[PDB]
Design a protein around this ligand. Structure first.
Ligand SMILES: Cc1ccc2ccc([C@H](C)Oc3cn4c(c(O)c3=O)C(=O)N3CCOC[C@@H]3C4)cc2n1
Ligand SMILES: [Mg+2]
Ligand SMILES: [Mg+2]
Length: 270
């Protein structure tokens, strides 16, 4: 995640965010961060299946064509069983899924950048740092929250901030990422100003007062910078997204027979 990034974009580049009704995404393909979704559904339980079933029905009823992306090896805990059960449900629902080689959000970004889908759906702001042109938030949110879809357009973030993607990555590192430490005492607005002036963490560090703003020791900022700009992602040319007919009888055998959900409920959803 990126600490304070959504708040910063709302304060300093508000035209990069649009709040939209779910009906406005008719006909669009979306790459869902399935790993972040199942985690949210979990926050033997069946809420990973309840969430995946109902939020997927919601997307399809609004004309959205979702593809679910699952995490691979890393560069409340979601288990192999949760992922396997969700994939089994997705297959019987006729919804496509992809296994990312590493972070799902980086591979959802790759699908958007390649033009395979319109947007990446995740609450994780790392998706923008990994370079997704469009990020949609609150797509899988409970109807109890009645949240609009919060869409971020990365090009307008870069445009309002007067930055390229390399500089934006260094800004996110200074904001506080999960790949390395940030510099203590430099807040979000000061980090924007420093990057706009000096462009890189390298040019900032050679200027900071070591008495005032020392940098972390064994700082992995170069490795973090490289992972965001060149992430390990799925090859979008190997992807052909297809959606098929849900298998109602098998969905009943799995959700009702094996997982004890209501038959009338599952049948009405199918
Ligand atoms: C509830 C909630 C809503 C939004 C949130 C945004 C960001 C974050 C933190 C700071 O960052 C991340 C957390 N996670 C993941 C990320 O990539 C990540 O960057 C992730 O992939 N998974 C895999 C499945 O297991 C859970 C993890 C969750 C936590 C959040 N928590
Ligand atoms: Mg992340
Ligand atoms: Mg993730």
């Amino acid at each position: 995640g990126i600490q304070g990034l959504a708040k910063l974009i709302a304060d300093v580049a508000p035209s990069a965010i649009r709040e939209n009704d779910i009906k406005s995404y008719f006909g669009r393909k979306v790459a869902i961060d399935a790993s972040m979704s199942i985690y949210q559904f979990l926050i033997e339980t069946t809420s990973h299946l309840m969430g995946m079933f109902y939020r997927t029905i919601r997307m399809m009823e609004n004309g959205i064509k979702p593809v679910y992306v699952f995490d691979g090896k890393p560069p409340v805990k979601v288990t192999k069983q949760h992922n396997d059960e969700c994939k089994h449900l997705l297959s019987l629902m006729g919804i496509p899924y992809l296994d990312a080689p590493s972070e799902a959000e980086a591979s959802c970004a790759a699908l958007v950048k390649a033009g395979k889908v319109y947007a990446a759906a995740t609450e994780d702001m790392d998706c923008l740092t990994f370079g997704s042109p469009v990020l949609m938030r609150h797509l899988t949110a409970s109807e109890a929250k009645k949240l609009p879809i919060q869409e971020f357009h990365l090009s307008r973030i870069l445009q309002e901030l007067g930055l390229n993607q390399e500089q934006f990555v260094d800004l996110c590192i200074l904001l506080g990422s999960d790949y390395c430490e940030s510099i203590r005492g430099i807040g979000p607005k000061r980090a924007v100003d420093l990057i706009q002036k000096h462009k890189s963490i390298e040019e900032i560090v050679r200027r900071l007062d070591p008495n005032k703003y020392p940098v972390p020791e064994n700082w992995l900022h170069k490795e973090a910078h490289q992972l965001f700009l060149e992430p390990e992602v799925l090859d979008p040319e190997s992807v052909e997204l297809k959606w098929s007919e849900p298998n109602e009888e098998e969905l009943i055998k799995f959700m009702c027979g094996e997982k004890q959900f209501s038959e009338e409920r599952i049948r009405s959803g199918v």
